[PDB]
């Protein structure tokens with residue numbers, strides 16, 4: 001039977017369109033085609049200073065967003081990473097099997113260790129979790145032995161490190177494993193920042209006019225898009241390389257039109273966006289983008305509100321058990337191969 | 347009743363330093379307080395290893411420990427890999443630490459293509475301790491820095507999360523917290539040491555221990571006395587001997603030498619000292635392996651099973667308290 005999918009999402013009041021288009025939107029297709037596993041990666045969130053109050057609120061808020069979006073706990077498995085000690089344990093086996101060198105060359109680590117304060121002596125103060133989390137990820141993946149791992153472009157190096165560790169583990173412990181395959185959305189694998197389209201939309205961006213947050217009110221969405229940096233070539237078409245700004249708004253618009261809401265918008269526009277905007281201004285593009293966007297956000301924020309606390313709890317409670325069903329099986333097999341545990345001596 | 351907690355890594359290289367440093371006092375500790383002792387295999391996989399040798403070593407260590415007096419009815423003896431709580435508690439300590447702090451560690455700084463675990467384990471050790479809110483952590487002198495890091499993390503989390511914490515207290519045997527290497531008395535006895543003649547292993551046969559001690563380096567003053575700075579060699583052999591005379595097996599010898607070793611060896615030679623140490627060490631090393639076989643593969647497993655349940659009890663209570671403090675888990679919603 002059925003092919004398996006695993007993916008994790010970090011919670012944050014900064015959840016944005018890059019996240020939605022990157023993985024969330026395709027979640028509804030996945031739970032129909034695969035045995036889908038999805039979790040709130042709160043063990044990745046605490047790798048930097050954080051407020052326990054904020055963490056709790058966010059973990060709750062993410063589950064509601066995923067539900068408001070269509071993730072069905074009857075068709076898929078949605079859990080909270082920290083609810084399973086199996087994650088910390090598997091993450092640990094991965095960590096002891098990695099070396100500092102490979103972890104230090106990670107691009108995300110470089111660009112992140114550079115995102116923080118220096119001690120009085122001038123040296124950088126880097127929480128250890130920033131260096132090691134990519135091993136936790138490898139473990140989160142391998143615990144469910146999935147066929148694919150749907151993620152955004154930015155997560156490619158991590159998938160590679162994970163396959164290297166899987167092969168490393170397989171070679172040394174002769175453990176029967178399945179190499180997880182990296183899978184990204186052909187079109188929306190990397191939504192760009194609206195202010196500086198040469199950078200991806202990030203929760204970490206200082207300037208917020210470049211990020212469309214999932215909890216941004218319509219008036220804010222309107223202003224941000226109206227100010228989206230374009231270019232002075234006045235030509236609406238897909239040209240990532242030469243017109244990052246316009247191209248970005250264009251591929252976002254295309255992805256939003258597939259949504260039920262926006263049915264009228266996509267009908268009014270036709271399937272050939274370039275042909276439609278052929279005789280129109282950049283302002284006409286921002287206008288259409290602002291409508292598809294507002295429509296989507298208002299419909300997420302709408303449904304997201306209907307989801308209740310109890311609902312979140314029961315959901316996570318069932319996911320916990322379900323996910324833990326396959327996590328224990330896998331960890332147990334690794335224990336055998338590693339020689340860990342006491343049920344290894346008669 | 348106060349609580350104690352300690353970990354020991356399994357290894358065919360188990361030596362006298364490990365025995366006098368921590369093992370020999372377990373008999374007393376399980377009587378004086380709530381003792382938790384575990385085989386630190388999570389720490390053993392921080393460097394390349396063989397899974398078969400690992401299960402074999404973990405098993406052997408439980409035997410040695412049982413054979414030396416650890417009573418499962420008076421203390422809790424378990425394998426840390428059996429508790430997922432360790433990996434989680436250690437993950438929390440880890441994310442609360444920083445690289446400089448860990449790069450400073452003498453072991454790492456003086457041991458650095460490096461296995462990631464070689465850098466992070468002091469944060470795991472910190473977690474192994476904190477998981478049981480012990481009053482004391484009985485270890486050898488060499489673990490001092492680790493306990494200092496544990497206290498630092500403890501206070502850091504206590505201030506950051508308002509968590510009700512009890513800082514662990516580093517405790518070492520005052521006379522045997524640092525057994526020195528027989529070849530080079532300025533260096534402590536270690537498993538890693540490449541000149542194996544300076545290290546008496548718990549499994550070293552009679553003729554081997556005889557040969558190692560007879561060759562123990564001394565000095566040229568011809569004075570048997572406690573004088574570590576000027577005479578590391580004889581002083582180390584002296585503190586080893588005195589410690590061994592406390593064991594039941596060396597009763598006859600104890601009566602012979604008396605309670606004042608400096609007085610006994612007053613009119614003797616270094617050869618005599620070596621001869622006494624040899625008799626005391628052999629009597630110990632052969633007694634231990636004797637009892638070691640009186641321990642079946644079954645007794646070990648059952649001991650670990652009970653230790654697991656007992657240990658998991660307080661470990662789970664401690665972890666839950668950390669969870670509600672870090673805002674982790676599903677129960678923190680509702």
Ligand SMILES: Nc1ncnc2c1ncn2[C@@H]1O[C@H](COS(=O)(=O)NC(=O)[C@@H](N)Cc2c[nH]c3ccccc23)[C@@H](O)[C@H]1O
Pocket residue numbers: 006007008009010011017018019020021022023041044136137140141149150151152153154155188189190191192200201202
């Ligand atoms: N601008 C962007 N465009 C498209 N996709 C984007 C994007 N910015 C972020 N994303 C994706 O949005 C998703 C969630 O963002 S995220 O929380 O930062 N993702 C992460 O931090 C992951 N490392 C979490 C994780 C931990 N273990 C895992 C195992 C499998 C998959 C993911 C994880 C990821 O798939 C990102 O790649």
Ligand SMILES: Nc1ncnc2c1ncn2[C@@H]1O[C@H](COS(=O)(=O)NC(=O)[C@@H](N)Cc2c[nH]c3ccccc23)[C@@H](O)[C@H]1O
Pocket residue numbers: 351352353354355356362363364365366367368386389470471474475483484485486487488489522523524525526534535536
């Ligand atoms: N030469 C020596 N003289 C006296 N004591 C010595 C010694 N050489 C080693 N020891 C002690 O022997 C005991 C076991 O040695 S050891 O396995 O190498 N110690 C370790 O590996 C520790 N990291 C084990 C550990 C993990 N988590 C812990 C939590 C609390 C206490 C210890 C641990 C420790 O207390 C050492 O300090």
